[PDB]
């Protein structure tokens, strides 16, 4: 997270840290005790599936205090429309092996109702993005969870303000831009899968997922988030489906 602050331990209780073989993988959001939403590209390389863990209650990656809870990730479900390596349909729903316990440091973020997300949340200007990703492009990842308040943009305005080329895909209806263009604040590598949470009349909701495209605070660019409103239905349905016998499951989307 470039230009952020440290999320005061417990203020980002929905934040998840995924680790593979002990190594930081991506971030993720907790929507309820056994379900975490992250970004599908995080699992593009994973070949040690049973070595995938999610930690909740994590803040400081260097010291261990009471509050962390680790769970193995029983299943990773990503849209059948995601293409490894791209940024479209960059959402992953993870089924923990055992539920976490909720405590003041582990709370789920409300997965909003689509209509409300599109009509009301989408016009809340600032939302918070968080993670233990690089603090500067190609810089050092963080140790204490970082959070950044970013303004969201309607795609017309995003296209209008971004510079023409780079390894920049298009901004589809399944993404949205939020950030700054003066390369000062943005999510960065290491933050993928983490939340983009919006505060509306006292509750926080999951509006986006840190995706990739642009390479951390690139001048003339904004960060791109998977627009969660377009997947609510899918997620909910998946969360009520019965376990099916795959670690990686490419669930039909829509």
């Amino acid at each position: 997270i470039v230009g952020g602050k440290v999320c005061p331990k417990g203020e980002c209780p929905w934040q998840v840290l995924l680790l593979v073989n002990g190594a930081q993988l991506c971030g993720g959001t907790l929507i309820n005790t056994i379900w975490v939403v992250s970004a599908a590209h995080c699992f593009d390389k994973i070949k040690n599936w049973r070595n995938l863990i999610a930690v909740l209650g994590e803040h400081d990656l260097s010291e261990h205090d009471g509050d962390e809870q680790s769970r193995r990730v029983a299943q990773v479900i990503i849209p059948s429309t995601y293409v490894p390596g791209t940024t479209n349909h960059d959402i992953a729903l993870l089924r923990l092996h055992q539920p976490v316990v909720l405590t003041d440091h582990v709370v789920p973020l409300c997965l909003p109702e689509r209509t409300f997300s599109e009509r009301t949340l989408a016009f809340v200007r600032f939302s918070l993005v968080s993670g233990w990703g690089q603090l500067l492009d190609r810089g050092a990842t963080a140790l204490e969870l970082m959070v950044l308040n970013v303004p969201r943009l309607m795609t017309q305005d995003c296209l209008q303000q971004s510079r023409k080329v780079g390894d920049s895909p298009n901004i589809t209806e399944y993404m949205f831009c939020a950030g700054y263009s003066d390369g000062s604040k943005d999510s960065c590598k290491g933050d993928s899968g983490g939340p983009h949470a919006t505060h509306y009349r006292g509750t926080w909701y999951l509006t986006g997922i840190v995706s990739w495209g642009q390479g951390c605070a690139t001048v003339g660019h904004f960060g791109v988030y998977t627009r969660v409103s377009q997947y609510i239905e899918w997620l909910q349905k998946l969360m009520r489906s019965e376990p099916r016998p795959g670690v990686l499951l490419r669930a039909p989307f829509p």
Partner: protein, 96 residues
């Protein structure tokens, strides 16, 4: 109406003439160039979420209904929600 002369200001507003143009001073509940829109008649969900704290539903010919997320229950006022659980989502316990 046309310039003040032709009482352009509706719903009890006062007109002020300018260079042909006028300005309408409306009453607290109306707005518009001619105090014509009734603030009191746009209780729809696209309009400041219907005044609902969480979810809104507009209904055909009837007032919209406010709802809440699981873990919450709507209050008497018909707009607010209160949690019916310990760790209701979207709440930060150390900040409560």
């Amino acid at each position: 109406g046309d310039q003040c002369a032709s009482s352009p200001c509706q719903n009890g507003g006062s007109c002020k003439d300018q260079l042909q143009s006028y300005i309408c001073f409306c009453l607290p509940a109306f707005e518009g160039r001619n105090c014509e829109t009734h603030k009191d008649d746009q209780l729809i969900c696209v309009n400041e979420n219907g005044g609902c704290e969480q979810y809104c539903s507009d209904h055909t010919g009837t007032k919209r209904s406010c709802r809440c997320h699981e873990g919450y229950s709507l209050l008497a006022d018909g707009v607010s929600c209160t949690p019916t659980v310990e760790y209701p989502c979207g709440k930060i316990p150390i900040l409560e």
